[PDB]
Design a protein around this ligand. Structure first.
Ligand code: SF4
Ligand code: SF4
Lengths: 280, 306, 323, 325
């Protein structure tokens, strides 16, 4: 088998991985085509049916399938537009932080010396606080908005990929083939990006899935605490920000947004389990 | 021993850095060489500032809330550790069993779980619908303790030593749900690292040597494998006790608990920057001290370090 | 002492097993030294791990007869297997660095080996450990007990392995490629130590190696293995003067020792059969210089020759090296 | 003029016990010298820690020396100058110990063989392909292997790719760091044959670093024996293998097994483990283990001397030759 073929072959071995993949695909589909598939606009108010139960409970109706929120706004519409923002910010946070983290990690791992010491020192400053507290401090300083949250989450995600890329590169640079290409005369840029990096891939393609899982939980965390996303907008964490008094009166408002976070993050941790399994 | 001098040599640069960063967050973002030495001179005298939402010194607001956070974090870690490690050992010994699958499956669930939402569901099921447990606070509104006694401020110790018969029972009642929700994540993590480390160690040649001596299966697992599989478990444990503050900021607001997380997030929402400026320095100092103690312990348990 | 008949060890799915050991049969007398030799695919070690019970569930062990000291090993209560392993059979393994537990002092690891099979007295067991470390030639036996495995050199670590194996007065000892990780002047000492213990205790010894020259000194009987099968067996002097099978002839003509100065060495063409490419008939048939139609149609029996040797060939080789 | 010449090559690694103590020198190699000739094999033999794997790293410019001189054809090879950097890489090349760790896992075989041409030469794509296929045919790999990854080759075929990679720049000296040690008996033979063939065809010289004296006996033209970073005996293949005179060589040869019963004319025993390079003995490095120890051997370090062509670093051989002492 070719390396791709062999990868997929092993991947299929894991049923959980498969199912997770399926669910991921589904949510992506939802996200992309939200506009068309959603039953109502996510800002619209049906003031005739405030806190209407889901369609299968005795008080509900088939018009509003998962019921309505306090202001008479439709939960299935809000969840599907929330899938859109949750995957959008997930992609942005993972792609920007993985680009910078690979580069700073390759530079720190290959050159050693003062350049290694200074990069790893500044990483250990920003890991001194737990990630969410540093993201909250940054979003407090620069003001709560969806964009400012995403750009705080890139900064606190970055040190984990720097640290793992360095660990992969130090396990790599002492191998004989990196020395063989140095005896043949390869320059520093060639050694890192054309000889070392293809082997550092494997350890990191699992961290992309952990990255999505953490970024969605951190978005949901910022949103629940009233930071980042703001109340008019359909985002799964902010939907749960003011809900606790409904624990007696309306179980759907509290259950469904968190169920959707759970599912999506579970799905991506299933990717990580599968990809890690499939690369050995 | 050269290893603790080595670890202090990495700690000092990071401590220096967080004092410079926390000075920058006090000199800028209000409401230079000579001014840094001054600010530090204030920190070492305990003058961390006076809060804006009420005019109490930040250190006098901190100490009672650090105590209320430590007790909850200790219960969450006892629960995690106690439950976690046995499960992870069992899972690896029973690889491929129903149990094995169950362990992994649950583990995944917990590790992928939004911790704030899980608190609301446990409140809704256990406290609101089935009425088995209390919904909020550290201890019930009808409990108070006689301030003439030398109370510690750890409510679960103080109500064991003093007060009416029923107060202790009520202290625990309030503790179980916060401990279980906070400890979920740690539990999950531990289980995964223990199972992984055990399946690495049960493949090592020294376990083949243990079997070749005729040792009983329980003695190969507990004396030979688990002794070495605990070395990774000590490191992960040290990471968990860093993330308990992020867990606490999310759970502590739901249960209305009088801890440090509710105080920090209220200060961030209210722009009470003196509480944030003092709180960041103390939380960073705590996490550095706990990392240094877990690194020192790792040095005692791993004989390659002596 | 040890009596093996039709031992087979299969790995993987029962529609198409990897036959890592395939219908082998041999016996070890009391006080005998037996060498097992073969190249990397040969299955030599798997035959011995199967006696100990160190094969895990992906592998399956079956035998017509696996008698040890008059005790059947196929249907033995686990308790009794424990009783046997470490006290009548013992084993030395390939890597001397990873074979000792890194977290316990070597005194704990010897005093444990004594505890499971003999008396428990702390003083008595420490005394027995000091006697054992004298017996394997440690420089300062009393101070070495408090030393961790990462502080020992490769040679010192393998002496501690022999001290655990010899602890309870064993009757058979298996050395699975003991010295291949070690320097030449350290190898010579460990093999002399095993042969000195063999002569002093009258115990049997099984050596597994790829180095034909090492068993040429040490062994009384040599067994040669190819592709999981036994292919020649005989007395250790004659087996390398008149080889009765094409594989031992080819394996010797590939040795530098059997060649002049700077002259080309012989070799057989092609790789060892794996799980996918098992030929019909004789397993050496793709490679063998003397092959004929019968060698493809029929699996050769392990024939016994008039001189007392055994060869798994339809045409066993004459005293001049020809069919 | 010698093809490659080394005068007093040495390497001291400075090591630190901890913050509380001075630095000290691990003298991993301490004044080796040789004259490698065109179309000849120089064999470097010794047990682990003797410095043989440092000499391979020095001569291939993987690490720089801390003294002495290395000349190729009368030109200095240890200058920093770019014109010497071309000569270094074109003329001297390496074959490594481990086949599993010396080919890059993610690159195709064609890629691995063309990379040296792409970095050093000006050859075109087609040209590079042509030269890679020609080298694979010379080394014994079929054309259809060109686009395979190294993880789908046997250990013998991996050392074939590693030898093919060395030969690309048309080298004069190929340095072989334990090249046949990981391989089994039929594959060793094969590899050896290939090597001999290439020697005979291209006119290479080998620096053969190994501890398998059996092989050495078969391959070698000139042999050098090392102990704790110094050369202790040097001479012709025949000389050393037929008439060894340093006490360590007598102990090392008699400790190797021999299949033929007549070869092991006497058995000699050392009764102790190797000195650590971190704490060298006071005098001769073999003084702790030597059958022949004598008053001078604790106080002074022996020096190589000619005793009839053979070079022997031993005061007792000196006295056997020189009774006046
Ligand atoms: S049986 Fe036939 S193929 Fe097998 S070794 Fe003998 S001659 Fe060769
Ligand atoms: S110099 Fe002395 S100690 Fe060294 S090898 Fe010669 S006789 Fe032995």
């Amino acid at each position: 088998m070719t390396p791709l073929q062999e990868f997929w072959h092993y991947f299929k071995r894991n049923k959980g991985a498969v199912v997770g993949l399926v669910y991921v695909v589904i949510v992506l589909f939802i996200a992309i085509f939200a506009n068309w598939i959603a039953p109502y606009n996510p800002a619209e108010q049906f003031r005739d049916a405030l806190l209407a139960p889901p369609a299968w409970q005795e008080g509900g109706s088939m018009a509003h399938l998962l019921g309505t929120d306090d202001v008479g706004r439709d939960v299935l519409s809000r969840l599907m537009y929330g899938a859109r923002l949750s995957l959008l910010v997930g992609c942005l946070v993972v792609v920007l932080s993985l680009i910078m983290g690979v580069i700073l990690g390759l530079i720190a791992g290959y050159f050693g010396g003062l350049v290694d010491n200074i990069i790893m020192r500044v990483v250990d400053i920003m890991l001194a606080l737990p990630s969410l507290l540093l993201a909250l401090v940054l979003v407090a300083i620069f003001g709560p908005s969806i964009g400012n949250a995403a750009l705080a989450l890139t900064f606190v995600a970055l040190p984990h990929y720097v640290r793992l890329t360095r660990a992969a590169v130090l396990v790599e640079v002492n191998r004989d083939y990196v020395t063989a290409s140095r005896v043949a005369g390869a320059g520093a840029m060639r050694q890192m990006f054309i000889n070392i990096f293809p082997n550092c891939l494997a350890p990191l393609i699992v961290q992309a899935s952990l990255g999505f899982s953490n970024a969605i939980l951190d978005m949901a965390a910022l949103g629940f605490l009233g930071m980042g996303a703001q109340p008019p907008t359909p985002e799964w964490g902010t939907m749960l920000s003011d809900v606790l008094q409904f624990a007696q009166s309306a179980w759907w408002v509290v259950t469904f947004p968190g169920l959707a976070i759970l599912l999506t993050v579970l799905a991506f941790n299933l990717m990580g389990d599968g990809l890690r399994d499939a690369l050995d | 021993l050269q290893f603790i001098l080595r670890r202090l040599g990495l700690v000092i640069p990071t401590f220096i850095g967080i004092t410079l960063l926390t000075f920058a967050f006090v000199h800028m973002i209000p409401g230079m060489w000579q001014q840094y030495l001054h600010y530090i001179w204030g920190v070492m005298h305990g003058d961390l500032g006076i809060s804006m939402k009420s005019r109490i010194p930040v250190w006098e607001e901190f100490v009672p809330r650090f105590q209320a956070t430590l007790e909850l974090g200790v219960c969450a870690m006892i629960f995690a550790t106690a439950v976690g490690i046995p499960v992870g050992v069992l899972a690896a010994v029973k690889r491929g069993s129903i149990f094995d699958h169950t362990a992994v499956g649950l583990a995944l669930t917990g590790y992928s779980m939004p911790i704030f939402w899980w608190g609301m569901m446990l409140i809704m099921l256990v406290s609101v619908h089935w009425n088995l447990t209390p919904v909020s606070g550290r201890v019930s509104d009808m409990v108070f303790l006689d301030d003439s006694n030398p109370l510690t401020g750890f409510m679960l110790i103080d109500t064991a030593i003093w007060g009416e018969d029923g107060n202790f029972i009520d202290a625990v009642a309030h503790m179980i749900l916060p401990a279980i929700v906070l400890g979920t994540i740690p539990l999950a993590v531990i289980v995964r690292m223990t199972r992984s480390s055990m399946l690495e160690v049960l493949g090592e040649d020294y376990i083949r040597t243990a079997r070749a001596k005729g040792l009983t299966r329980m003695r190969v697992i507990i004396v030979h494998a688990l002794r070495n599989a605990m070395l990774p478990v000590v490191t992960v444990i040290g990471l968990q006790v860093g993330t308990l503050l992020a867990g606490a900021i999310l759970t502590e607001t739901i249960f209305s608990w009088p801890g440090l997380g509710r105080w920090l997030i209220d200060a961030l929402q209210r722009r009470d920057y003196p509480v944030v400026q003092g709180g960041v320095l103390l939380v960073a100092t705590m996490i550095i001290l706990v990392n240094l103690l877990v690194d020192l312990l790792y040095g005692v348990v791993n004989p390659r370090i002596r | 002492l040890l009596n093996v008949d039709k031992l087979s060890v299969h790995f993987g799915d029962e529609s198409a097993p990897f036959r890592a050991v395939d219908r082998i049969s041999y016996s070890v007398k009391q006080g005998e030294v037996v060498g097992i030799v073969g190249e990397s695919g040969s299955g030599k070690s798997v035959s011995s791990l199967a006696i100990m019970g160190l094969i895990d569930y992906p592998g399956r062990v079956m035998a017509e007869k696996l008698e040890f000291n008059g005790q059947d090993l196929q249907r033995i209560s686990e308790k009794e297997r424990r009783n046997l392993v470490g006290a009548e059979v013992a084993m030395i393994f390939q890597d001397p660095m990873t074979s000792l537990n890194p977290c316990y002092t070597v005194g704990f690891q010897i005093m444990e080996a004594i505890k499971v099979h003999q008396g428990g007295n702390k003083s008595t067991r420490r005394q027995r450990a000091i006697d054992l470390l004298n017996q394997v030639g440690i420089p300062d036996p009393a101070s070495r007990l408090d030393v961790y495995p990462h502080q020992l050199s490769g040679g010192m670590s393998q002496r501690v392995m022999i001290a655990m194996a010899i602890a309870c007065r064993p009757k058979l000892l298996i050395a699975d490629e003991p010295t291949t990780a070690l320097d030449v002047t350290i190898q010579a000492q460990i093999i002399e130590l095993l042969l000195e213990l063999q002569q002093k205790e009258n115990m049997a010894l099984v050596l597994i190696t790829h180095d034909l020259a090492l068993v040429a000194e040490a062994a009384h009987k040599i067994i040669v293995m190819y592709a999981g099968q036994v292919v020649e067996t005989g007395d250790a002097h004659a087996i390398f003067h008149a080889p009765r099978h094409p594989y031992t002839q080819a394996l010797l003509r590939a040795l530098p020792e059997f060649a002049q100065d700077k002259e080309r060495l012989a070799s057989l063409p092609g790789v060892v059969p794996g799980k996918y490419d098992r030929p019909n008939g004789c397993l050496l048939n793709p490679r063998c210089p003397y092959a004929t139609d019968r060698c493809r149609a029929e699996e050769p029996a392990l024939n016994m020759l008039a001189d007392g040797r055994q060869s798994k060939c339809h045409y066993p080789l004459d005293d001049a090296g020809r069919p | 003029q010698p093809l490659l010449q080394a005068i007093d090559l040495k390497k001291h690694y400075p090591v630190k016990k901890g913050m509380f103590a001075p630095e000290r020198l691990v003298k991993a190699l301490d004044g080796v010298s040789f004259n490698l000739e065109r179309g000849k094999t120089l064999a470097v033999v010794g047990e682990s820690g003797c410095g043989k794997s440092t000499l391979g790293r020095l001569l291939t410019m993987i690490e720089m020396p801390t003294g002495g001189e290395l000349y190729y054809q009368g030109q200095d090879l240890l200058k920093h100058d770019p014109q010497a950097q071309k000569l270094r890489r074109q003329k001297i090349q390496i074959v490594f110990q481990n086949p599993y760790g010396s080919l890059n896992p993610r690159k195709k075989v064609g890629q691995i063989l063309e990379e040296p041409l792409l970095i050093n030469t000006s050859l075109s794509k087609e040209q590079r392909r042509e030269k890679a296929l020609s080298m694979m045919a010379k080394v014994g790999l079929k054309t259809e292997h060109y686009d395979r990854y190294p993880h789908m080759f046997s250990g013998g075929q991996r050392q074939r790719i590693a030898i093919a990679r060395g030969l690309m720049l048309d080298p004069d000296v190929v340095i072989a760091d334990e090249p046949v040690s990981a391989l089994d008996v039929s594959v060793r033979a094969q590899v050896l044959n290939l090597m001999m063939d290439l020697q005979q065809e291209l006119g290479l010289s080998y620096v053969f670093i190994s501890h398998d004296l059996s092989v050495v006996e078969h391959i070698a033209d000139e042999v050098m024996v090392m102990y704790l970073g110094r050369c202790v005996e040097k001479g012709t293949k025949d000389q050393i293998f037929n008439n060894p005179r340093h006490p360590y060589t007598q102990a090392l040869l008699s400790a190797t097994p021999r299949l033929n019963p007549d070869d092991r004319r006497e058995r000699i025993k050392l009764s102790g483990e190797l000195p650590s390079p971190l704490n060298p003995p006071p005098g001769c490095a073999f003084n702790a283990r030597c059958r022949r120890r004598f008053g001078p051997c604790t106080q002074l370090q022996p020096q190589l001397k000619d005793y009839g062509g053979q070079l022997v670093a031993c005061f007792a051989v000196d006295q056997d030759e020189n009774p006046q002492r």
